[PDB]
Amino acid sequence: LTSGSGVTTRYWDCCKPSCSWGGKASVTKPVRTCKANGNTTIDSNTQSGCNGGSSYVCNDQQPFTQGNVGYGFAAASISGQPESQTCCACYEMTFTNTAISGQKMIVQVTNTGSDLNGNHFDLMIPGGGVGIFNGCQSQWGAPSNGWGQRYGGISSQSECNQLPTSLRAGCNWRFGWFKNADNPSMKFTQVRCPTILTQKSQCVRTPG
């Protein structure tokens, strides 16, 4: 199992995540994707809105809390590891350096980010910036650059009102439990995916 130190980012480009295709890892089902509305299930082979299709990330895949523990979904780039090893794997991380230092978040990986060297987790947070891609204009009518900055997104919890209502929980999570931490570093360890995440994503690594 994988563990180490890493860096994080925040992002929400609305796109169908890479682990939502079949054949990317040994799993029960690929990660669930949705229609434009963010709630009704679309077929896992439907093309992504980011590539001219009609499939998006589900409202269900926003960050949340259980007790004091954070939970969410993320893109990851884990030190030269293929998607067969990362897709729908879960990692629990202890934040190491911001106002959220010491806090614990458990994410399920649903996407592969950019191949930077090392361990990189891009937390999926509504309003945290679209990044390289943006299917949020076609899904929600967001601005061409996303909500706020293309990188980092909005600056204030007041601007969470600019987001679709369906994402406002996740948006707010960034300023409450997450404390609008800016790229918190962490240490992480792979864990068996909790049902509170896998009952949302529907993607369970099945060889065990």
Curated annotation (Swiss-Prot):
It catalyses: Endohydrolysis of (1->4)-beta-D-glucosidic linkages in cellulose, lichenin and cereal beta-D-glucans. GO terms for cellular component: extracellular region. Optimum temperature is around 40-50 degrees Celsius. Has more than 50% of the maximal activity between 10-70 degrees Celsius, and more than 30% of activity at 0 degrees Celsius. Stable at 50 degrees Celsius for 30 minutes. 60-80% of the maximal activity is retained between 0-10 degrees Celsius. Displays 40% of its maximal activity at as high as 80 degrees Celsius. Remains active at 60 degrees Celsius for over 8 hours. Approximately 50% of the activity is still maintained after 4-hour incubation at 70 degrees Celsius. Its main location: secreted. It is an enzyme of class 3 (hydrolase). Transmembrane segments: none annotated. Keywords: Carbohydrate metabolism, Cellulose degradation, Disulfide bond, Glycoprotein, Glycosidase, Hydrolase, Polysaccharide degradation, Secreted, Signal. N- and O-glycosylated. Contains hybrid- and complex-type N-glycans. It is found in: Secreted. One of its GO terms (biological process) is cellulose catabolic process. Its EC number is 3.2.1.4. PANTHER family: ENDOGLUCANASE 1. Hydrolyzes carboxymethylcellulose (CMC). Also hydrolyzes lichenan and barley beta-1,4-D-glucan. CMC is hydrolyzed majorily to cellobiose (G2), cellotriose (G3) and cellotetraose (G4). Cellohexaose (G6) is hydrolyzed to G4 and G2 with traces of G3. Cellopentaose (G5) is completely hydrolyzed to G2 and G3, and G4 is partially hydrolyzed to G2. Does not hydrolyze G2 or G3. Does not hydrolyze crystalline cellulose, soluble starch, xylan, mannan or laminarin. This is Endoglucanase. It comes from Cryptopygus antarcticus (Antarctic springtail).
